[PDB]
Amino acid sequence: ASKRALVILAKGAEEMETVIPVDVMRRAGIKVTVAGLAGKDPVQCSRDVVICPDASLEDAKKEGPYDVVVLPGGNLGAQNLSESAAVKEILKEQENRKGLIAAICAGPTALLAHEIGFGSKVTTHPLAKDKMMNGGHYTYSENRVEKDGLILTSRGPGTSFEFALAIVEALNGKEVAAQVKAPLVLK
Amino acid sequence: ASKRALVILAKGAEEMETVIPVDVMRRAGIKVTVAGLAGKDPVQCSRDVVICPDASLEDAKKEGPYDVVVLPGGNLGAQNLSESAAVKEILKEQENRKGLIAAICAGPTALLAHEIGFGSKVTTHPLAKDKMMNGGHYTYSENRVEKDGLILTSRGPGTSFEFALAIVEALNGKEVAAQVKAPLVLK
Ligand SMILES: *[C@@]1(=O)C(=O)[N]C2=C(C(=O)O[C])[C]=[C][C]=C21
Numbered sequence A, B: 001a002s003k004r005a006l007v008i009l010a011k012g013a014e015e016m017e018t019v020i021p022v023d024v025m026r027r028a029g030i031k032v033t034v035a036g037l038a039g040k041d042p043v044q045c046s047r048d049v050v051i052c053p054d055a056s057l058e059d060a061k062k063e064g065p066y067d068v069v070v071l072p073g074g075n076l077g078a079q080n081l082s083e084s085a086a087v088k089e090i091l092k093e094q095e096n097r098k099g100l101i102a103a104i105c106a107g108p109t110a111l112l113a114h115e116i117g118f119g120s121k122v123t124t125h126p127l128a129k130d131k132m133m134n135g136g137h138y139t140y141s142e143n144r145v146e147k148d149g150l151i152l153t154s155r156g157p158g159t160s161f162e163f164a165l166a167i168v169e170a171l172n173g174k175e176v177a178a179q180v181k182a183p184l185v186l187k
C-alpha cells in the first residue's frame, strides 16, 4: 500500500515549494494528489507559473484520508489556505487521526489560522515568524526543517528539498529518503 | 530594458529544473517566457506536474531574440529538445549572436544533438556524462555549475538554484543575484 499525499494548491502558492515536494514525493513512490483549492482549473502561482491540479480539493477530500497533508507557502497562497473552511476541516480531521501535517515558508501560518497543532515547535520563513507567533501558540525554531508532534515545518524555497525529503523519511523511512536523494545532486 | 529569457518546455521535462529557474529569474526582474515545444497546450512533466506554457515556441520565436535560452533537463524532455528542428534554429541563432545558452541535467545533451558550443567546458548529470561526451566534442567538468564561452551548464534538480542564480548573475550582475538569493533561505 503506497503512502498518499494531499498537496493543496491555491492561487499565489510558491511554485517551487509546490513542485519540489510533489516531484520528490513521487520519486519516493508516494501517490501524490495536487488538489486545487478553488476547483479543477489551472492555478496561477506567485511567480506566474501556471500549474494544472490533478483534481479539485472538493473531489480530492472524498478520496481521503491521506498519510500527509502538505501546505506550500507563498504569502498569498497561504492567505488563501488560511481563509478556507475546506482546509480547516481537512487539517482538523488529519490532526484528529494523528496524521502528518507538513507546511513550508508562510504555509505554517495556515495552521495558526485553523488552530492546528498548538504547542508544537515550528519554523517558518524568517519574515513570517511574527505572524506565526501571534499569541505564542507555538514554540519557534530556526532549524531548516522542524518536526514536533504531528507537525513538520520548513523555512523557504531553499529548504524545499530538505522539507520534501523529511516528508519522505517520515512516510517511507530513512533508506528510501537516502535513495531518492542521491540522484538529485544536492550539496 | 529588462533582460529576457526563453525557457523551452517539452513533454518529460524535469519540472523542478523548469520551475526553479523560471521563478528565480522572475525574482530577478527578468522577463521570462515559458514556451511549449509542442504548442500552446499544457505540458506533462517527468513527474506528472502539468505546466501551462506562456506561449507556443512557434509564437515565442517571433518575439526573439532573448538574452538567455534555457533548456531544462528530464531525460525525455531533453530527448524531445534534441529532436526538434525549431530548437536547433533557436540555439544556432543564439550562438551566432553570442547570446547566453543555459542547460541543466540532461539538457546539455540537446547542445550536442544540435552541434552547439563545441569545445566548451560543460557539466551534466553524472548519468548523462557518457552521452554528452560521445565524440569528445566538449571538455567535462564536475563543477555544480560550469560556464565557458556562451555555455552555462549544471548537473541536476539539486543544483537548480545555483544554475538559476548563475543565469541571474550573468544577465543582471552579482549584486542582483545576491539580493535575490537572500530571501530563498538557501544553505
Ligand atoms: C515564502 O515562499 C512565503 O510563503 N513567504 C515568504 C516570504 C515572506 O515575506 O513571508 C512573509 C519571503 C520569502 C519567501 C516566502
Ligand SMILES: *[C@@]1(=O)C(=O)[N]C2=C(C(=O)O[C])[C]=[C][C]=C21
Pocket: A183, A184, B014, B017, B073, B074, B075, B078, B104, B105, B106, B107, B125, B127, B128, B156, B157
Ligand atoms: C536529470 O533531471 C536529467 O535530465 N537526467 C537525469 C538523470 C539521468 O538518468 O540522466 C541520464 C538522473 C537524475 C536526474 C536527471
Ligand SMILES: [Cl-]
Pocket: A014, A046, A073, A074, A075, A076
Ligand atoms: Cl510569496
Ligand SMILES: [Cl-]
Pocket: B014, B046, B073, B074, B075, B076
Ligand atoms: Cl528524467
